[PDB]
Design an enzyme around this catalytic site. Structure first.
Site, PDB file in Angstrom:
ATOM      1  N   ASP A 181     -13.812  28.762  39.559  1.00  0.00           N
ATOM      2  CA  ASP A 181     -14.330  29.396  40.779  1.00  0.00           C
ATOM      3  C   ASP A 181     -15.092  30.688  40.467  1.00  0.00           C
ATOM      4  O   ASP A 181     -16.095  30.994  41.127  1.00  0.00           O
ATOM      5  CB  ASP A 181     -13.184  29.719  41.759  1.00  0.00           C
ATOM      6  CG  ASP A 181     -12.869  28.593  42.765  1.00  0.00           C
ATOM      7  OD1 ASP A 181     -13.358  27.447  42.659  1.00  0.00           O
ATOM      8  OD2 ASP A 181     -12.085  28.876  43.706  1.00  0.00           O
ATOM      9  N   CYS A 215     -25.764  21.910  42.116  1.00  0.00           N
ATOM     10  CA  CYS A 215     -24.523  22.652  42.284  1.00  0.00           C
ATOM     11  C   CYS A 215     -24.537  23.126  43.736  1.00  0.00           C
ATOM     12  O   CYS A 215     -24.904  22.340  44.612  1.00  0.00           O
ATOM     13  CB  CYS A 215     -24.411  23.740  41.216  1.00  0.00           C
ATOM     14  SG  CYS A 215     -25.935  24.787  40.998  1.00  0.00           S
ATOM     15  N   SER A 216     -24.158  24.372  44.059  1.00  0.00           N
ATOM     16  CA  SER A 216     -24.321  24.790  45.458  1.00  0.00           C
ATOM     17  C   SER A 216     -25.770  25.193  45.772  1.00  0.00           C
ATOM     18  O   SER A 216     -26.383  24.630  46.686  1.00  0.00           O
ATOM     19  CB  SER A 216     -23.344  25.919  45.803  1.00  0.00           C
ATOM     20  OG  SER A 216     -23.329  26.093  47.235  1.00  0.00           O
ATOM     21  N   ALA A 217     -26.353  26.120  45.007  1.00  0.00           N
ATOM     22  CA  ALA A 217     -27.752  26.499  45.243  1.00  0.00           C
ATOM     23  C   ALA A 217     -28.759  25.708  44.406  1.00  0.00           C
ATOM     24  O   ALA A 217     -29.958  25.734  44.721  1.00  0.00           O
ATOM     25  CB  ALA A 217     -27.969  28.002  44.960  1.00  0.00           C
ATOM     26  N   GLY A 218     -28.315  25.005  43.374  1.00  0.00           N
ATOM     27  CA  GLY A 218     -29.209  24.277  42.493  1.00  0.00           C
ATOM     28  C   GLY A 218     -30.018  25.128  41.507  1.00  0.00           C
ATOM     29  O   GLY A 218     -31.114  24.703  41.118  1.00  0.00           O
ATOM     30  N   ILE A 219     -29.493  26.282  41.081  1.00  0.00           N
ATOM     31  CA  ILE A 219     -30.184  27.135  40.107  1.00  0.00           C
ATOM     32  C   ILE A 219     -29.291  27.665  38.995  1.00  0.00           C
ATOM     33  O   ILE A 219     -29.767  27.910  37.880  1.00  0.00           O
ATOM     34  CB  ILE A 219     -30.903  28.309  40.812  1.00  0.00           C
ATOM     35  CG1 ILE A 219     -29.928  29.229  41.555  1.00  0.00           C
ATOM     36  CG2 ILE A 219     -31.988  27.781  41.737  1.00  0.00           C
ATOM     37  CD1 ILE A 219     -30.612  30.512  42.181  1.00  0.00           C
ATOM     38  N   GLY A 220     -27.999  27.846  39.243  1.00  0.00           N
ATOM     39  CA  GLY A 220     -27.117  28.449  38.249  1.00  0.00           C
ATOM     40  C   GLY A 220     -26.482  27.498  37.240  1.00  0.00           C
ATOM     41  O   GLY A 220     -26.994  27.355  36.122  1.00  0.00           O
ATOM     42  N   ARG A 221     -25.353  26.864  37.590  1.00  0.00           N
ATOM     43  CA  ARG A 221     -24.823  25.769  36.758  1.00  0.00           C
ATOM     44  C   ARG A 221     -25.880  24.697  36.473  1.00  0.00           C
ATOM     45  O   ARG A 221     -25.953  24.155  35.353  1.00  0.00           O
ATOM     46  CB  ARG A 221     -23.601  25.131  37.441  1.00  0.00           C
ATOM     47  CG  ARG A 221     -22.468  26.113  37.660  1.00  0.00           C
ATOM     48  CD  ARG A 221     -21.345  25.522  38.511  1.00  0.00           C
ATOM     49  NE  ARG A 221     -20.526  26.592  39.085  1.00  0.00           N
ATOM     50  CZ  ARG A 221     -19.518  26.391  39.934  1.00  0.00           C
ATOM     51  NH1 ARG A 221     -19.219  25.163  40.325  1.00  0.00           N
ATOM     52  NH2 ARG A 221     -18.831  27.427  40.408  1.00  0.00           N
ATOM     53  N   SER A 222     -26.674  24.345  37.485  1.00  0.00           N
ATOM     54  CA  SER A 222     -27.708  23.315  37.319  1.00  0.00           C
ATOM     55  C   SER A 222     -28.716  23.722  36.244  1.00  0.00           C
ATOM     56  O   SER A 222     -29.180  22.883  35.457  1.00  0.00           O
ATOM     57  CB  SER A 222     -28.432  23.076  38.650  1.00  0.00           C
ATOM     58  OG  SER A 222     -27.601  22.427  39.636  1.00  0.00           O
ATOM     59  N   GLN A 262     -28.142  32.354  36.788  1.00  0.00           N
ATOM     60  CA  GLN A 262     -27.933  33.354  37.843  1.00  0.00           C
ATOM     61  C   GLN A 262     -27.280  34.648  37.369  1.00  0.00           C
ATOM     62  O   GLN A 262     -27.307  35.639  38.113  1.00  0.00           O
ATOM     63  CB  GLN A 262     -27.035  32.776  38.943  1.00  0.00           C
ATOM     64  CG  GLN A 262     -27.725  31.833  39.884  1.00  0.00           C
ATOM     65  CD  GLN A 262     -26.754  31.260  40.936  1.00  0.00           C
ATOM     66  OE1 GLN A 262     -25.841  30.487  40.622  1.00  0.00           O
ATOM     67  NE2 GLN A 262     -26.940  31.662  42.168  1.00  0.00           N
TER      68      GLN A 262
END
Ligand SMILES: CC(=O)NCC1(c2ccccc2)CCOCC1
Length: 284
Positions: A181, A215-222, A262
Site C-alpha cells: 500500500d 494501475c490506479s493512474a496508469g503512470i507509476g507502477r505501470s 511517480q
C-alpha cells in the site's frame, strides 16, 4: 556511466531526489486538449493525469472517441504498450472496447481494487464462471474461464465476445497482487518473476496488438513495468549492454505519456529490477 555503479554512487551520495527532479524538469510537455473537454470529466480518474493528444488511443466510435489511455511505441526495442488508468464505473465498457479494437492478448493489472481503504479501480472482470458480465453501452460479453492463484500474482483466462458479430477471443489477465500500500517492494524478485510470466504467454509479442497495462493512474507502477521490460530487451539486443541508459529510456517513454515513474523510490526500484534481471537472463 554504467548502471550498477551509477546506482551505488547515488545510494552513497543520497541524491535520488535530485536525479528524479532532473528527469521531471527535462520531460516533454505536449497538449492534452481532448482530455480536458468538459464532456470528458467523468472519463478521467485524476485531473492532473491526462493522455497527450498525439499518442492517445481513440475508440472506434463517432459520438465520443475518448479514453484515458496512451500508446507507448519503443522503436529500437521493437515493443509497444498501452498504458491506461484503472477503469471507472462509467468507463468499464470503453476499456473492453479498447482491448477488442486494438487486438490485445493480455491485460496487466498492478493494483488491488481496494487499497488504503479506498477504491482504486472498478471491479471490471467477473469473479465466478457462471456469472458473466455484459457491457451494454459497447455490446460486449466477458466470461471468466479459469483462474490460477499464486502467492504473488493471479492469472485468469477470460473470453471476450463481440455481440454484434459473435466473434470471440481469449484474453489473459495478469494480476500482480502484492505491491505494498505504501512505498515499493523490498526485493524486485517477485516483480521480475511476474514480468517473465507475462513474456512467456506471448502477450508482449508482435503477433498481437499491444499489451494493456494499468494501475490506479496508469503512470507509476505501470511505468516501472514497461521501463524494466524495455531496458532488459535492449541489453539483449545491443553489442554493449552497459550502454543502456535507464534515464534516457524513461525520458523517451515520457514523450508518449506524462508522469511515468511517480517517486524517487520508484526510480530506484526500477534500477534495482533491471540490474538483478540482467544477471538472470544470462547467460545466467
Ligand atoms: C478456442 C479454444 O481453444 N478454447 C479453449 C478454452 C478457452 C475458451 C475461452 C477462453 C480461453 C480458453 C480453453 C479451456 O476452456 C475451454 C475452452
Amino acid at each position: 556511466m554504467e548502471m550498477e555503479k551509477e546506482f551505488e554512487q547515488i545510494d552513497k551520495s543520497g541524491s535520488w531526489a535530485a536525479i528524479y527532479q532532473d528527469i521531471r524538469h527535462e520531460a516533454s510537455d505536449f497538449p492534452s486538449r481532448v482530455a480536458k473537454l468538459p464532456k470528458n470529466k467523468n472519463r478521467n480518474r485524476y485531473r492532473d493525469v491526462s493522455p497527450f493528444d498525439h499518442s492517445r488511443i481513440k475508440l472506434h466510435q463517432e459520438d465520443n472517441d475518448y479514453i484515458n489511455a496512451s500508446l507507448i511505441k519503443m522503436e529500437e526495442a521493437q515493443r509497444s504498450y498501452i498504458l491506461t488508468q484503472g477503469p471507472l464505473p462509467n468507463t468499464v465498457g470503453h476499456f473492453w472496447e479498447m482491448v477488442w479494437e486494438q487486438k490485445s492478448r493480455g491485460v496487466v493489472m498492478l493494483n488491488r481494487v481496494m487499497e488504503k481503504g479506498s477504491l482504486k479501480c472498478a471491479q471490471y472482470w467477473p469473479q465466478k464462471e457462471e456469472k458473466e458480465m455484459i457491457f451494454e453501452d459497447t455490446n460486449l460479453k466477458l466470461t471468466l474461464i479459469s483462474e490460477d492463484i499464486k502467492s504473488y500474482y493471479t492469472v485468469r483466462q477470460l473470453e471476450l465476445e463481440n455481440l454484434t458479430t459473435q466473434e470471440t477471443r481469449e484474453i489473459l489477465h495478469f494480476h500482480y497482487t502484492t505491491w505494498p500500500d505504501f512505498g515499493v517492494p523490498e526485493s524486485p524478485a517477485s516483480f521480475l518473476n511476474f514480468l517473465f510470466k507475462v513474456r512467456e504467454s506471448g502477450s508482449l509479442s508482435p503477433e498481437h496488438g499491444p499489451v494493456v497495462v494499468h494501475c490506479s493512474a496508469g503512470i507509476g507502477r505501470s511505468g516501472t513495468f514497461c521501463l524494466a521490460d524495455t531496458c532488459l530487451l535492449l541489453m539483449d539486443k545491443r553489442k554493449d549492454p552497459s550502454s543502456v541508459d535507464i534515464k534516457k529510456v524513461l525520458l523517451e517513454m515520457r514523450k508518449f505519456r506524462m508522469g511515468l515513474i511517480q517517486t524517487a523510490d520508484q526510480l530506484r526500484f526500477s534500477y534495482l529490477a533491471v540490474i538483478e534481471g540482467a544477471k538472470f537472463i544470462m547467460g545466467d
